[PDB]
Ligand binder design. Structure first.
Ligand SMILES: Nc1ncnc2c1ncn2[C@@H]1O[C@H](COP(=O)(O)O)[C@@H](O)[C@H]1O
Ligand SMILES: Nc1ncnc2c1ncn2[C@@H]1O[C@H](COP(=O)(O)O)[C@@H](O)[C@H]1O
Ligand SMILES: OC[C@H]1O[C@](O)(CO)[C@@H](O)[C@@H]1O
Ligand SMILES: OC[C@H]1O[C@](O)(CO)[C@@H](O)[C@@H]1O
Lengths: 124, 124
C-alpha cells in the first residue's frame, strides 16, 4: 500500500485515518475487538527519535482514534500502550501506540480488515 | 504539596519535572525501578477530556522523562501505558502515563522518594 510500517507496506484499505504526520490502521490479529494502531508516518524505531511535532500529532491522533473505537466497538474505557524497545516487547521496529477498547469483564482476512477500516473512516 | 493528582496533594519533593501543562512524579510503590508518572497538571479523569495542547505537552513531557529514567535506572527499553477508564484499570481518576524502564529479563518512604526525585531533577 502507500503506508510504511516497519519493513512492510500497509495497504490504504486497512488505514482509516491519516494526518499531516501520523496514520491509524486496524490489526490482522486484534487482541480485543477494536484493537487498532496509531503510528507516526515516518518510520522511527524508538520514541525518543520522534521530533516534538510528531509526538504531539502521534498523541492528538491517538486521542481521536480512541474516542472513535471506544464508541464503535462499545467499550467503557481504553488501554493505551507503546512497547518502546526490544526489552519492552516491540516486535515491529516502528513507534506505535496500541489502542484497545475496554469493557467490563474482558486472525481475519484483508477484507474483514478493510470492512472495519471503512466503518471507522466514517466517524472522521 | 502544590500538585494535584486526583483527590490527593502531591508534595513537590516527589515531583522532579514540571512544565507549562504537565508534571512528573516518582511512585510510592514502583512496579519496576524507575516507574514514574507523567500527568497533566489539570486533573481530568479521561484522556478525551484533555485539550490538544495538554495532549501534546503530556506526551512531549513523557518523551523527555522516558529518556531520563531509561538512562538513570539502566534500562534498554521502556513501556508506556495509560489506563484510561475504570474498565482499563484506572485507580486514580486523573489522566496519567506510566513510564517504566525495561531491561533484559525482568514501598518506600517519602525520603527515599524525594532522594530519587532529586536525582532525576538533575537530568533536566
Ligand atoms: N502488516 C501488518 N498489517 C496489519 N497489522 C500488522 C501488520 N504487521 C503487524 N501488525 C500487527 O501490529 C502489531 C505488531 O506486533 C500486532 O498487533 C501485529 O499483528
Ligand atoms: N499520592 C501519591 N503519591 C505517589 N504515588 C502515588 C500517589 N497516589 C497514587 N500513587 C501511585 O500512582 C499509581 C496509581 O495507581 C500507583 O503507581 C500508585 O501507587
Ligand atoms: O463491531 C462493532 C460493531 O458491530 C456491532 O456490534 C454489530 O454490527 C455494531 O453496532 C458495532 O458498531
Ligand atoms: O537507581 C539507579 C541508580 O543507582 C545506581 O545503580 C547505584 O547508585 C546508579 O548508578 C543509578 O544511576
Amino acid at each position: 500500500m502507500s503506508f510504511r510500517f516497519g519493513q512492510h507496506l500497509i495497504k490504504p484499505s486497512v488505514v482509516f485515518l491519516k494526518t499531516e504526520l501520523s496514520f491509524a490502521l486496524v490489526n490482522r490479529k486484534p487482541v480485543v475487538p477494536g484493537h487498532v494502531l496509531v503510528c507516526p508516518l515516518r518510520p522511527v524505531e524508538r520514541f525518543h527519535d520522534l521530533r516534538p511535532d510528531e509526538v504531539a500529532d502521534l498523541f492528538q491522533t491517538t486521542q481521536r482514534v480512541g474516542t472513535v473505537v471506544e464508541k464503535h466497538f462499545h467499550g467503557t474505557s481504553l488501554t493505551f500502550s507503546m512497547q518502546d524497545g526490544p526489552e519492552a516487547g516491540q516486535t515491529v521496529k516502528h513507534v506505535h501506540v496500541h489502542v484497545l477498547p475496554r469493557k467490563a469483564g474482558d486472525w481475519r482476512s484483508e477484507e474483514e480488515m478493510a470492512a472495519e477500516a471503512a466503518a471507522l473512516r466514517v466517524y472522521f
